[PDB]
Amino acid sequence: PGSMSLKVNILGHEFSNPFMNAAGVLCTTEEDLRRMTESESGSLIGKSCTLAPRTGNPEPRYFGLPLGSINSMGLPNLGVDFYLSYAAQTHDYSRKPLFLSMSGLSVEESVEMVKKLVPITKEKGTILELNLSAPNVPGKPQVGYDFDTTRTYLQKVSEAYGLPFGVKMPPYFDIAHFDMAAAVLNDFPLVKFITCVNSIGNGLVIDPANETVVIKPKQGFGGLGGKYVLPTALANVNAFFRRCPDKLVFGCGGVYSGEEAFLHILAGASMVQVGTALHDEGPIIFARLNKELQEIMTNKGYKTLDEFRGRVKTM
Template sequence: MGKLDLSVNIGGLELKNPVMTASGTFGYGEEFADFYDINDLGGILVKGTTLNHREGNPYPRMAETPSGMLNAVGLQNKGVDYFVKHINPGLLGLRTAVLVNVNGSTIEEYVKTAQIVNELDNIPAIELNISCPNVKEGGMAFGVSPKQAEAVVKAVREVYKKTLIVKLSPNVTDIAEIARVAEASGADGVSLINTLLGMAIDAEKQRPILSTITGGLSGPAVKPIALRMVWQVAQAVKIPVIGMGGIMTATDAIEFLLAGATAIQVGTANFVEPTAAIDILHGIEEYMSRHGIESVQDIIGALKY
């Protein structure tokens, strides 16, 4: 066998391999640099970035659940200007794709944040998180309504000139419909799934565990749902799909690729095992060698019926 080809393309964004880290689970990358060379990954997604400084939600805002975890961190970050001045200079030397996860409470906030990130030469793409509550529309998430999803993606597409990936909420009746709307509105790719809405209760205290009562469920518990949604969306759109949701091992990642994902993101696994993402990459390489597969493209969407 020749050299393995793990390269993939997400709407013009060239990745050396399909393994990325999920936003909010990998900090700004440097937190994991002691464990392995993060340049070996296909890409990293820095934590959610908003126009203005956000404190996030009150504690407690994380809870362990069977086969997963709930989080209600609330997009704590110091805002996009702080990111540009203080964080981004430390990312300039990285030899892997660095993507910024962009969030907002209004369309205007999304647009302004995307405009600022558009000017950063070293950031080739953004991931637009449309699971945020729209404060002007009564708090319903942008990604739950096709009309709202269309409005925010179109507005950002007008000002953002590089690769635009839209992160989809699974808390919808038909995720394929929202994916088609994102595609029609100018998205170069979609990533899914974001967390599922869940809650945890302390029976002895008879109180919710999270300060916000409900939070986002991630980890192995959500994987079968994530896999199904990725498979559905990959059938529904022509743009690339990035799959995530409970990917803990290389086998999990390969299942997502077989279901139609062009790339994957490792999230909750980073909290359990800091080397999870690189371990998964090595496992994909081992799988390809074992099966005599030279190009990862031969696995993508190769599910047999």
């Protein structure tokens, strides 16, 4: 205290800064995870994994846009065994804490996956982010848009895993939905953080030149990231910050600079995840974001994030 710091605390762990990759970006392979570990990021998270490996959807399945991105990756991943081995043997925990995202396509699959994480969480401190918002799996709706199904996942994972974990939520657009989602989450004491938000699901981008969609899967429909999602993300962060006071909120969506990171934290974010901008710029972005956030804080006379986290002013 009394000195400028970007440090963050979560259940004992101390993080150097609030920044990490958004799940799915620069975190699928050992090489990806090494580059994230080597970066100036406060933490990193592994690709949303499934019990068995997946190669994902056919190409093209990612398209960069002026205002962000559209993707239908289809959960390409090396399978849970790979991520667990990485967490257990490979990751350098002296550099930074590690999160793993898990996206079992059924409650049954999720239970089996999280049971395997338990020993490694105990041994190494690996943190779980349960993905309830994957929008690009043909035939599987975003779990988080069904509160009955969501309650089932949270119950079974709480029983099987039995340790503090977090959830990656879809964006909500209705006050009643904020209320219902919070009511479910507030029934699970083991849920200690909420990541707001996953991509804005099932957008469509068309090229006027050739009258053709720009991605191949699902007739061109894909999740939107980047500048498109910033107001949505801030609203979700703030809505859950207020409704779930005993839980932390991680902000994800539209972060390209210190300015957006500042707004996320104002809204209530503990950690700030970076997807599209990281895909564009590479891991050097974390060095830039640390600098830019420090600049804004200096200009406003803040030394720590604790001075302005959740202090957004209403009228």
